[PDB]
């Protein structure tokens, strides 16, 4: 259905061009539900250390 949220974390990351980070999240057992609870510093702590991807992720989290 159009304009619904991503079905899973891979879907979200694909949308924001961040699939290069999917396995980092998977290794920490972070699924979509947990991802949507993360703060900026949580993302940095997991290894999303670059400004661009971290910003696209915080934007996505706020969006969904």
């Amino acid at each position: 259905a159009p304009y619904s949220g991503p079905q899973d974390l891979a879907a979200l990351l694909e949308q924001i061009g961040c699939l290069k980070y999917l396995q980092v999240f998977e290794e920490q057992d972070v699924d979509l539900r947990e991802f949507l609870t993360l703060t900026e510093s949580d993302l940095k702590e997991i290894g999303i250390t670059l400004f661009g991807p971290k910003r696209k992720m915080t934007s996505a989290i706020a969006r969904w």
């Binding site: 670059l50 400004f51 934007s59």
Partner: protein, 60 residues
Amino acid sequence: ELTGILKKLSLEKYQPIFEEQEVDMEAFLTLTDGDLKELGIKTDGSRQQILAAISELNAG
């Protein structure tokens, strides 16, 4: 695109920051004064020019 924006502002010296930090256009258009300081652009005038460019792009 980004490299062209910086070129037109005569601020291509900052391109390596955006490239290494993987700042694409989507991310670039969200950048605030604080973000530019954090990225390392300490020169006030540089931030003023970049933010003005971002503002015009987001206008409307």
